[PDB]
Design a protein around this ligand. Structure first.
Ligand SMILES: *[C@@H]1O[C@H](CO)[C@@H](O[C@@H]2O[C@H](CO)[C@@H](O[C@@H]3O[C@H](CO[C@H]4O[C@H](CO)[C@@H](O)[C@H](O)[C@@H]4O)[C@@H](O)[C@H](O[C@H]4O[C@H](CO)[C@@H](O)[C@H](O)[C@@H]4O)[C@@H]3O)[C@H](O)[C@H]2NC(C)=O)[C@H](O)[C@H]1NC(C)=O
Ligand SMILES: *[C@@H]1O[C@H](CO)[C@@H](O[C@@H]2O[C@H](CO)[C@@H](O[C@@H]3O[C@H](CO[C@H]4O[C@H](CO)[C@@H](O)[C@H](O)[C@@H]4O)[C@@H](O)[C@H](O[C@H]4O[C@H](CO)[C@@H](O)[C@H](O)[C@@H]4O)[C@@H]3O)[C@H](O)[C@H]2NC(C)=O)[C@H](O)[C@H]1NC(C)=O
Ligand SMILES: *[C@@H]1O[C@H](CO)[C@@H](O[C@@H]2O[C@H](CO)[C@@H](O[C@@H]3O[C@H](CO)[C@@H](O)[C@H](O)[C@@H]3O)[C@H](O)[C@H]2NC(C)=O)[C@H](O)[C@H]1NC(C)=O
Ligand SMILES: *[C@@H]1O[C@H](CO)[C@@H](O[C@@H]2O[C@H](CO)[C@@H](O[C@@H]3O[C@H](CO)[C@@H](O)[C@H](O)[C@@H]3O)[C@H](O)[C@H]2NC(C)=O)[C@H](O)[C@H]1NC(C)=O
Ligand SMILES: *[C@@H]1O[C@H](CO)[C@@H](O[C@@H]2O[C@H](CO)[C@@H](O)[C@H](O)[C@H]2NC(C)=O)[C@H](O)[C@H]1NC(C)=O
Ligand SMILES: *[C@@H]1O[C@H](CO)[C@@H](O[C@@H]2O[C@H](CO)[C@@H](O)[C@H](O)[C@H]2NC(C)=O)[C@H](O)[C@H]1NC(C)=O
Ligand SMILES: *[C@@H]1O[C@H](CO)[C@@H](O[C@@H]2O[C@H](CO)[C@@H](O)[C@H](O)[C@H]2NC(C)=O)[C@H](O)[C@H]1NC(C)=O
Ligand SMILES: *[C@@H]1O[C@H](CO)[C@@H](O[C@@H]2O[C@H](CO)[C@@H](O)[C@H](O)[C@H]2NC(C)=O)[C@H](O)[C@H]1NC(C)=O
Ligand SMILES: CC(C)C[C@@H](NC(=O)O[C@@H](CCC(=O)O)C(=O)O)C(=O)O
Ligand SMILES: CC(C)C[C@@H](NC(=O)O[C@@H](CCC(=O)O)C(=O)O)C(=O)O
Ligand SMILES: *[C@@H]1O[C@H](CO)[C@@H](O)[C@H](O)[C@H]1NC(C)=O
Ligand SMILES: *[C@@H]1O[C@H](CO)[C@@H](O)[C@H](O)[C@H]1NC(C)=O
Ligand SMILES: *[C@@H]1O[C@H](CO)[C@@H](O)[C@H](O)[C@H]1NC(C)=O
Ligand SMILES: *[C@@H]1O[C@H](CO)[C@@H](O)[C@H](O)[C@H]1NC(C)=O
Ligand SMILES: *[C@@H]1O[C@H](CO)[C@@H](O)[C@H](O)[C@H]1NC(C)=O
Ligand SMILES: *[C@@H]1O[C@H](CO)[C@@H](O)[C@H](O)[C@H]1NC(C)=O
Ligand SMILES: [Ca+2]
Ligand SMILES: [Ca+2]
Ligand SMILES: [Cl-]
Ligand SMILES: [Cl-]
Ligand SMILES: [Zn+2]
Ligand SMILES: [Zn+2]
Ligand SMILES: [Zn+2]
Ligand SMILES: [Zn+2]
Lengths: 696, 696
């Protein structure tokens, strides 16, 4: 028969392996011919796999590339203006790829051009709190300095924004062995650690959900009217360049000025980690000079969109999407995800050729230009926003299936918590020592919930991937699942070879997943979720799980405010409305759940009415006015952190109103805005609750 | 049986008459006790009439009232500062009402306080083109002058905005007999003309759809956080007061300076209509002084919301709404509408008591505070926006049923054109000389379409009534219908006794509609529309009618642009994308219409899928970013005119970008913005078209 088990049993580790090899032999950088050729290949294969239609959706977006005949690099210059040390022009290519053409050298995409020259200040991870420590506690002024920051902890675009706001005239980003070299493991090609010549590529935009910097709000189609570059969204104002730890050692070893303030500022290199500014006595007349010549260029990109039409509710869409573009070979990011999507489409297509169709329509997407700011997913969603907001049931992301081989890592809306628990209880653990046990059992053992015994950790959605437009702009229930490494403290830093030329097929096959069993398990989780969302008669969302988390978030935000009890008295700052709304949501959700299990199961209108109530529940948390100064982050419960795009923040409007409030010059105005955000949150929670009330 | 004919036959002229008398014996000013008492009465009666639930929804909004012990008035002062002439403190009350308490004296709601003193400039109707003529052609400077303007042609808030922008320090509004005294008709109480002591009340806000000035975006509930008055939306900065033509004659008779520029500036009073500034030689040292002491006050208002639950689609809402608050007795505005709504609810309730229910849910609303800026409808829609945008099928307004007795006047979305044609063909004309003929026949004869032989005129929706939030903010298909007077050239000026103490029951019964036959016909049109919208199996919308009008609007906007052919060449301004989108909409709508008539009529999912496509078609014209500087006008095809809130403008984003473009100092920038608006319009039309495509 044609059920979830038939779907899941058709998925094969060996196919995922074959696909990963196929997708990682040459670079697939967004906007390049090689990436268009792969788009055409996946379009052809998805048609052959059995999808009803498979189309390319193209857009012309702003991208950024180094100048091939004018390379980017950093120097130390002496007082004569001789360049006495230069950083590398490329990463040493991996064995057997030293003749591959078109490997883009390391660069920070969207850096402006410039040749700034100055003294270095070391800023640790360039986090908001690192800059607070420098300016407020240490009294070090970054104005007109070049800052050097280690990668890790937060999205690199936030580091750049923080350095600009501190008055830096350039930023150097580097990978410290403390963050990218696990003790006791060898460097690539002999292990999975970053070598000293390896460098992490990546964009440094602050788009806040806008998509293409030139066309915020509207798709970058053939007649689009573009902003001028001076009005573009999210571009950095100062030059930025990334380097490896061999080169960083050379820039850091001569650093003078103040000692590091404590040990959380010292990495693993044999240098003092002095903060500066500038070099010690003998070298105090030497300076650092950047040479950045990259150009921004409007360039065509291509999404592949595959449709499997639903048999009963073809106007309800379940979307499985992940990106195809890579920095170089994309052995983990993104092709370990794309190979999994490819096998899922193949399995669904096998069932379709046997006469089966899902209840609801399934859309499959291979997005382009994710690495340049989620551009392909965002432009397509802008083009199709009316269809998505009235018809979109759920979005399941599918970037890298593995970033480690320890346990599962899931981030999703609370509406999917019960679905994920139930599905993982029905899947076999691939883990050593859990033979014969469920994935739920191994995952719960290795990643326990901080709040509940016998349950696994599930995190908030932040951003930094292609679910952002669907979840934070449009309010479509979204989720993601992948295998990860131990110690989720380091989760925002990436794995050691992230965005380097060393992320290859061989890396995955030799060091991560030789039997492709972790890939297979992740295919069963993502595919199983899509199967349930597209086939369950009642949508598999539990509104009571939202009620639980809303109380947790309300307790958390109240606790932050209560660090300022005198101000809460003076300005009559009350959270009563917010707790009332959460209480009401809890009561209404409980009654709705009772009707959902009781309602006349023979009545397809009451069913679809109740399915519409479940589908539009995530949508109810959207505020059409957006969050302050971030018009494309419209979800009132969740937004990417203003300090770290990768992290989700709960009740973000109230959180940002409270952040560093003790430093605001006009406290009455500042606390007025806290009160306004409490009203907006309490109203939105109550409005969302009321969508679950009886409809008339 | 229980069909539309049973509904329509139950409606009685005599009941409408009884209700109108009942609703007009005492003033029902928003925020007053008398108006709360009437809300409670209508709640009780709607329950007794048979509705499933009837609730009050209350809000606390900014309202404005004169000071009872410090009256507003205008003077002419001599050089000694003696007040030699004062305007009236009240309108002489009508016969038998001279002892009615709490008649609010004439005032302009939301005027600031002030006692400005200066020279008068006469500005005709204070339209954008009147100010253009004064400053540009006549070289008259209004800076620091008091302007005097006649009512008519455009909404009074636009006059006030125009006077402020010209630098006026006060505005005097008056009713000229040219606009408010029909030749050969007697003054009230002997006829329906405005007496010389009659004065038109009315608010002078420029809200642009915001609702309560203190809470834009969110309902003014019990925990709302308000803006300070300095940040309130839409308040005027200069004092404003209205007067009758006896008083206006006294202010205008001494006017000197320049002669009127032509005869379209002269009204019917025996004065020169000199433009000023100031008075002629002998009186040149006299000035005009305003004394305004009104206060703005947050005040509770109450909407009555009645529900008749649908039998098959209870989660689909058809709304019939109109306001209850009046300036004084509200004999025409609004109680001639409210009495009709009351009889419609009574008829629906009779059918319900016999076991009938409509297919879809019908919501009935008695809105408060319409006269102070559409506040009650807008706050309720802000509170319920998530429910309305996912479930709202249609909104039918119900302000005054009659403003004349000549023929029908309909404004609606093109989606309702076919519904209105079909219904009026099935109704009897009440008109003299059309006995035995259809309403369609009399209406088409008296108000022919400017474009099509054998069809009636149907106008665009503008604003100035409670449909605004539903149609221009939320994108719910909306319509309105009433009986009107001849010569629709004067349609924006009102009938002579509009917003005066003389609008009484006696006015309607003696002079407008003694047999209540025009009221009955309007009840059959509004009720018949609500019946069809709530009961037709397929929603009674024809998307092909939108396609026709979109081509007309595209031709019109292209023609405006083509007055500037040299600029269109220089800046490559092309309308090709917009015409392409309209062509595509036309083709897709045609194919959708074919499926709608062909689809398997036994399949309720294809039906509801296709009903959802019809319901969300109006919704597709909403841009979540709004129009420039008008965030609550989000419909891209229609917005209230920026020059006249009562008039609708088509493709408003392009129209406003083109308006007076030859006067912009930076033509490249100005034409860039025209091109941006063409892209937005072309994109939105294509996106709306695509919602009618096959769904997968
Ligand atoms: C969580 O869910 C509950 C419902 O269980 C909501 O409760 C409502 O809470 C508000 C307070 O925010 C109450 O508002 C009060 O309404 C009174 C009149 O209520 C009657 O009439 C209405 C019809 O209009 C009915 O809906 C209702 O059942 C009652 O019969 C007003 O008189 C109150 O105003 C007076 O008191 C206040 C406070 O002291 C003064 O400031 C005023 O000036 C005035 O004197 C007040 O407005 C409302 O009645 C409650 N509804 C109920 C119980 O059904 C919560 O609001 C909701 N939480 C959130 C965050 O939305
Ligand atoms: C009204 O409806 C029609 C559909 O009937 C839409 O037509 C589309 O119009 C656009 C132009 O705006 C066409 O875009 C062109 O697409 C070419 C590739 O198309 C092929 O591949 C796609 C899959 O990606 C298929 O959908 C399609 O069927 C084709 O097989 C590009 O090569 C074109 O770019 C090249 O030419 C232009 C113009 O000279 C250059 O500027 C470029 O640099 C490049 O050389 C171009 O982008 C699109 O193909 C049309 N779709 C069709 C026919 O199905 C209208 O757009 C629509 N109106 C509006 C307002 O939306
Ligand atoms: C995840 O799995 C759990 C456990 O199976 C699911 O909860 C269970 O769901 C069913 C509904 O299919 C409930 O059965 C019902 O029981 C009541 C009597 O209590 C009866 O009236 C109904 O006719 C029906 O048989 C069952 O109680 C419930 N168990 C719980 C809550 O412990 C859950 O729905 C799954 N989550 C999904 C699909 O998202
Ligand atoms: C307003 O009234 C007109 C005239 O009645 C309505 O148009 C008519 O609608 C019916 C659909 O109920 C059409 O009948 C169909 O004819 C085709 C064959 O051409 C057949 O395949 C179908 O089975 C069905 O019988 C009829 O053609 C059509 N007449 C027209 C367009 O002239 C119109 O729908 C009404 N508008 C509303 C309800 O909004
Ligand atoms: C990846 O797999 C695809 C699909 O099998 C290969 O593309 C095919 O190559 C054959 C032989 O060269 C051609 O005849 C077909 O036209 C191709 N099919 C499609 C759908 O493109 C591709 O060569 C493989 N790539 C690598 C690097 O191994
Ligand atoms: C670092 O690179 C720079 C640029 O290529 C080198 O400086 C150049 O040296 C050549 C040959 O001596 C001169 O013709 C250029 O005028 C120099 N350019 C600049 C911008 O200074 C420099 O030698 C390199 N330093 C090393 C390898 O230590
Ligand atoms: C308007 O009609 C209503 C409803 O008939 C009248 O209110 C009723 O008055 C009677 C007798 O005074 C009371 O016993 C009822 O309690 C009232 N009913 C309701 C539902 O309020 C009202 O008096 C009429 N008003 C005028 C001015 O004639
Ligand atoms: C217009 O009204 C004003 C204000 O009431 C009158 O001027 C006042 O006259 C009284 C009695 O003579 C004085 O006590 C006040 O000091 C005056 N007030 C002001 C503000 O001037 C004025 O007489 C009236 N003019 C008429 C009726 O022609
Ligand atoms: C496989 C993961 C490590 C990919 C990682 N995302 C990611 O690398 O996306 C890119 C682009 C993200 C963005 O521009 O928002 C980046 O961070 O440089 C994430 O989802 O955490
Ligand atoms: C019966 C009509 C003459 C009522 C008329 N509307 C109306 O009087 O509304 C009021 C308030 C309108 C507003 O504030 O938008 C006004 O214009 O003063 C209209 O719809 O044209
Ligand atoms: C890149 O640098 C070369 C060589 O100096 C120069 O000729 C060219 O203008 C640059 N290319 C771009 C795209 O700016
Ligand atoms: C940092 O330095 C610049 C000038 O070199 C100055 O404008 C700025 O105010 C300084 N900030 C401080 C001292 O906080
Ligand atoms: C994969 O698992 C093995 C066994 O625990 C381990 O030695 C290896 O380090 C893991 N690989 C990675 C990349 O973590
Ligand atoms: C109205 O005027 C009176 C009398 O001059 C004054 O006492 C009162 O303050 C005013 N009322 C308001 C509401 O401003
Ligand atoms: C109108 O008068 C004021 C000063 O009385 C002046 O500021 C303004 O520029 C004048 N406008 C003209 C002459 O257009
Ligand atoms: C009502 O109709 C009669 C007959 O044409 C006419 O004399 C009268 O003026 C009309 N009333 C109004 C208010 O137009
Ligand atoms: Ca865009
Ligand atoms: Ca409001
Ligand atoms: Cl992912
Ligand atoms: Cl109306
Ligand atoms: Zn990725
Ligand atoms: Zn990446
Ligand atoms: Zn009215
Ligand atoms: Zn009115």
């Amino acid at each position: 028969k044609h059920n979830m088990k038939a779907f899941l049993d058709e998925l094969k580790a060996e196919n995922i392996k074959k696909f990963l090899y196929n997708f990682t032999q040459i670079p697939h950088l967004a906007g390049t011919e090689q990436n268009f050729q792969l788009a055409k290949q996946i379009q052809s294969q998805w048609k052959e796999f059995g999808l009803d239609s498979v189309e390319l959706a193209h857009y012309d977006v702003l991208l950024s590339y180094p100048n091939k005949t004018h390379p980017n690099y950093i120097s130390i210059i002496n007082e004569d203006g001789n360049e006495i040390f230069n950083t590398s022009l490329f990463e040493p290519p991996p064995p057997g790829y030293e003749n591959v053409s078109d490997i883009v050298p390391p660069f920070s995409a969207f850096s402006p051009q410039g040749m700034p020259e100055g003294d270095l200040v070391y800023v640790n991870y360039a986090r908001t709190e690192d800059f607070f420590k420098l300016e407020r506690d240490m009294k070090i002024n970054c104005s007109g300095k070049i800052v050097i920051a280690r990668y890790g902890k937060v999205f690199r675009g936030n580091k750049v924004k923080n350095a600009q706001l501190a008055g830096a005239k350039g930023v150097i980003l580097y990978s410290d062995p403390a963050d990218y070299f696990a003790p006791g493991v060898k460097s690539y090609p002999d292990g999975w650690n970053l070598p000293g010549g390896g460098v992490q590529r990546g964009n440094i935009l602050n788009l806040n959900g806008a998509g293409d910097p030139l066309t915020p709000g509207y798709p970058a189609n053939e007649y689009a009217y573009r902003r001028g570059i001076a009005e573009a969204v999210g571009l950095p104002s100062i030059p930025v360049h990334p380097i490896g730890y061999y080169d960083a050692q050379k820039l850091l070893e001569k650093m003078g000025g103040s000692a590091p303030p404590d040990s959380s500022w010292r990495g693993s290199l044999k240098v003092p980690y002095n903060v500066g500014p500038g070099f010690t006595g003998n070298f105090s007349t030497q300076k650092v000079k950047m040479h950045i010549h990259s150009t921004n260029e409007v360039t065509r990109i291509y999404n592949v969109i595959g449709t499997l039409r639903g048999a009963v509710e073809p106007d309800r869409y379940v979307i499985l999407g992940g990106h195809r573009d890579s920095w170089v070979f994309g052995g983990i990011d993104p092709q370990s995800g794309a190979a999994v999507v490819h096998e899922i489409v193949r399995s669904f297509g096998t069932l379709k050729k046997e006469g089966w169709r899902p209840r609801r329509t399934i859309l499959f997407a291979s997005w382009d230009a994710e690495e340049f700011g989620l551009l392909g997913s965002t432009e397509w969603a802008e083009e199709n926003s009316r269809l998505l907001q009235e018809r979109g049931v759920a979005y399941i992301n599918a970037d890298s299936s593995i970033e480690g081989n320890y346990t599962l890592r899931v981030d999703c809306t609370p509406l999917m918590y019960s679905l994920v628990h139930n599905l993982t209880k029905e899947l076999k653990s691939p883990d050593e020592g859990f033979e014969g046990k469920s994935l739920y059992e191994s995952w719960t053992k290795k990643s326990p919930s901080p709040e509940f015994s016998g349950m696994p950790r599930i995190s908030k959605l932040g951003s930094g991937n292609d679910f952002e437009v669907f979840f934070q702009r449009l309010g479509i229930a979204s989720g993601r699942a992948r295998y990860t490494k131990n110690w989720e403290t380091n989760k925002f830093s990436g794995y050691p070879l992230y965005h380097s030329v060393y992320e290859t097929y061989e890396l995955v096959e030799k060091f991560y997943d030789p039997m492709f069993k972790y890939h297979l398990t992740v295919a069963q989780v993502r595919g199983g979720m899509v199967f349930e969302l597209a086939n369950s008669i009642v949508l598999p969302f539990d509104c009571r799980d939202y009620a639980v988390v809303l109380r947790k978030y309300a307790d958390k935000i109240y606790s932050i405010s209560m660090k300022h009890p005198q101000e809460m008295k003076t300005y009559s700052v009350s959270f009563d409305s917010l707790f009332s709304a959460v209480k009401n949501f809890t009561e209404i959700a409980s009654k709705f759940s009772e009707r959902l299990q009781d309602f006349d199961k023979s009545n397809p209108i009451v069913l679809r009415m109740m399915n519409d109530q479940l589908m539009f529940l995530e949508r109810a948390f959207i505020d059409p006015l957006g969050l302050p100064d971030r018009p494309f982050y419209r979800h009132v419960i969740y937004a990417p952190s203003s300090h770290n795009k990768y992290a989700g923040e709960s009740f973000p409007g109230i959180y940002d109103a409270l952040f560093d409030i003790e430093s605001k010059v006009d406290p009455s105005k500042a606390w007025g805005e806290v009160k306004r955000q409490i009203y907006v949150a309490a109203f939105t929670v109550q409005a969302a609750a009321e969508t679950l009330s009886e409809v008339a």
